[PDB]
Amino acid sequence: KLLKDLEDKYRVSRWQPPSFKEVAEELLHYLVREGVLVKINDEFYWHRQALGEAREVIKNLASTGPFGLAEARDALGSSRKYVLPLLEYLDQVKFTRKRVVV
Amino acid sequence: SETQKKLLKDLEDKYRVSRWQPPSFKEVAGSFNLDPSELEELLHYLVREGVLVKINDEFYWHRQALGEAREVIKNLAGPFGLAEARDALGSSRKYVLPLLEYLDQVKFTRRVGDKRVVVGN
Amino acid sequence: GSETQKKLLKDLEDKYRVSRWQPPSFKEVAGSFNLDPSELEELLHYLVREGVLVKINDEFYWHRQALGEAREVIKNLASTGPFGLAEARDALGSSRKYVLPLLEYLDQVKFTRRVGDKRVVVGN
Amino acid sequence: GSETQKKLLKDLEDKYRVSRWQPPSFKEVAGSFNLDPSELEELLHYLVREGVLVKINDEFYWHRQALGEAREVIKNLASTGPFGLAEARDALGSSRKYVLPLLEYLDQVKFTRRVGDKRVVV
RNA sequence: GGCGUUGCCGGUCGGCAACGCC
RNA sequence: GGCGUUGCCGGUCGGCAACGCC
RNA sequence: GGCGUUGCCGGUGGCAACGCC
């Protein structure tokens, strides 16, 4: 039950997920290990599906050249707040590196 | 036909990013700039293929968005009201009312009383 | 008590004359001259009697001249209307730690009067 | 206004009273009060004439009270022998830039006398 | 995080920053 | 490197450090 | 006026809630 609600909370929120405090490790780590969630930073986690088409959006954007944080925010319709961590997470996992999709 | 097939994936991603607040027919007509029942030749083709799903006359939901909405609705259930469901997805009657009518028609959720119940099929 | 004790009175006075509007506290003075409280307390009281220092509060003594000058600055600031602690501080280029004790002292000798959170100069 | 000019004179004085032993230069005062040399020069002379300020050199004027106190500090410092410029700077807690002009001024009105690289209060 | 000391700020019993310690 | 402005230092016409320019 | 919390913004401070003083 608590694992289903945790999942929905992130799924419903999508590209603008709640922070650890807002939702407030035992459970989250489990979902991460189950492919349900993925850690972007110490702050908040993202639903993998949400992270999925969110990545698909970034990819379809960099098609027409580089792109800064501002541009990223527009396509995802989020805010520099949530878009900056996400984009940094992508530089990490090597999805990108303005920015370019490598 | 490059400037033709690129309009199909173009619309798909449009409904893809819109998720639970899908753009209406009338609305998408101007966003891409295309005739009335002419956009139909695009929407319906994607419809038959299954990429888009028609909930009502006004708008369609991308294949996935429906799946996920159905997942959140599956969690929400014993019984639930339209308000509880609207909060479950954090949406408005504008879209939720139509989606629930759809889910009734496809026998996903049945209206047992003034509330619906996700039929465990 | 000889003549080197007399130089001590001079070096003490100068400590206050130089420090001016940010006078050293009893503790700092004791430390600077390496004095026992009892010695310092009597030296200060002597300087007060001789009209060299004026006691603002148990912590701070002010050189009489420093005080007189601060009163002139405050008098001019008070010309345009009542004034708050912050303006007195800006006017003196000092800090709250040093200015509040001066203003409380001035209210006490009735040079100024605090009404609300402002003061007005009544004296000369 | 007249009372407006009167206030301006109180603010010039205050500027010198507050700054004491590190008085602002002519240039600095002009910029602060947004005055033209012509005006500042006459205002200062008024102040000197009024016994409020004392000209130390061409850049520096000192408040009369700040000068008297610096003299007192120098007197006690020289009580135990000739003193150098650096010793004067330490006793006053100032800097060479402000102290040397003061000492040259004091030699001038003969308060002190320089002999070699040291001074004595006459 | 907690405690303390100091400084500056805002009238005043707080806020900010050193530093000490747990 | 060169020139320059400023500040502190050393009696004074130089040392140190910002800063500006070349 | 001091300060703090939060949101948006511009890649790293600006505007604006709300709050304490």
Curated annotation (Swiss-Prot), chain B:
Coiled-coil portions: none
Protein location: Cytoplasm
Function: Translation factor necessary for the incorporation of selenocysteine into proteins. It probably replaces EF-Tu for the insertion of selenocysteine directed by the UGA codon. SelB binds GTP and GDP.
Family: Belongs to the TRAFAC class translation factor GTPase superfamily. Classic translation factor GTPase family. SelB subfamily.
Protein known as: Selenocysteine-specific elongation factor
Species of the source: Moorella thermoacetica
Whole-protein coverage range: 512 to 634 of 634
